[PDB]
């Protein structure tokens, strides 16, 4: 269930940014902690990198996937993995969602689940083993970022 858990975190973050809460039992405790930390990092990246983010047009899910993979390959190229870098992946997906909502040439809600897929694929394939060895999401991420 490793991929599915990360896909659900990425989808919950996307629904948070788009302000489209899905009814039912709601997000898990990991998801709730992740949403505040990643949103804080997202607003900081948006502010600092506004000029260069504004020069790019996210016109399709293919462009979002390509930009996500190029930016995240560079973010992790030195071989270091830490929780802050993992929170930045979610923050970056939130930026791409916002730009896609503004500039997607043929708007399609069913294409938003493609973003949660390519975020989960990157996390699983590049950081999954480190995540497990550092406590997973409940004994690693939550313990580190939950309120004291
Ligand atoms: C001003 C930087 C820039 O041109 N790009 C960019 C690089 C990295 C980045 O975010 C990561 C995560 C937070 C930071 N630690 C760095 C955001 C923007 C562009 C990269 C290109 C030129 C494509 O390689 C860029 C611009 C706009 C978008 Cl939507 C994506 C990437």
Query: Domain coordinates of the chain in residue numbers?
Result: 1-148
Name all residues whose Cβ lies below 6 A of ligand 1: 45, 49, 52-53, 56, 58, 67, 70-71, 75, 88, 92, 99
At 84, list the tokens.
């802050």
Task: Write the residue with the smallest CA distance to atom 25 of ligand 1.
Answer: 53
CA distance 117 to 52: 26
What top-level class would CATH report for the domain 1-148? mainly alpha
Contact at 8 Å (CB) between 30 and 142? yes
Contact at 8 Å (CB) between 99 and 58? yes
Nearest-atom index, ligand 1, CA of 45: 13
Task: Identify the experimental approach.
Answer: X-ray
Contact at 8 Å (CB) between 97 and 17? yes
Name the resolution in angstroms.
1.4
């Amino acid at each position: 269930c490793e991929f599915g858990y990360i896909y659900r975190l990425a989808q919950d973050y996307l629904q948070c940014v788009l302000q489209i809460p899905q009814p039912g039992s709601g997000p898990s405790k990991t998801s709730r902690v992740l949403q505040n930390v990643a949103f804080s990092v997202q607003k900081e990246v948006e502010k600092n990198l506004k000029s260069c983010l504004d020069n790019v047009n996210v016109v399709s899910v293919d462009t979002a996937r390509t930009l996500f993979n190029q930016v995240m390959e560079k973010e992790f190229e030195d071989g270091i993995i830490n929780w802050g870098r993992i929170v930045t992946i979610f923050a970056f997906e939130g930026i791409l969602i916002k730009k896609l909502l503004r500039q997607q040439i043929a708007p399609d809600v069913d294409t938003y689940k493609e973003i949660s897929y390519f975020v989960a694929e990157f996390i699983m394939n590049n950081t999954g083993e480190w995540i497990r060895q550092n406590g997973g999401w409940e004994n690693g991420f939550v313990k580190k970022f939950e309120p004291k």
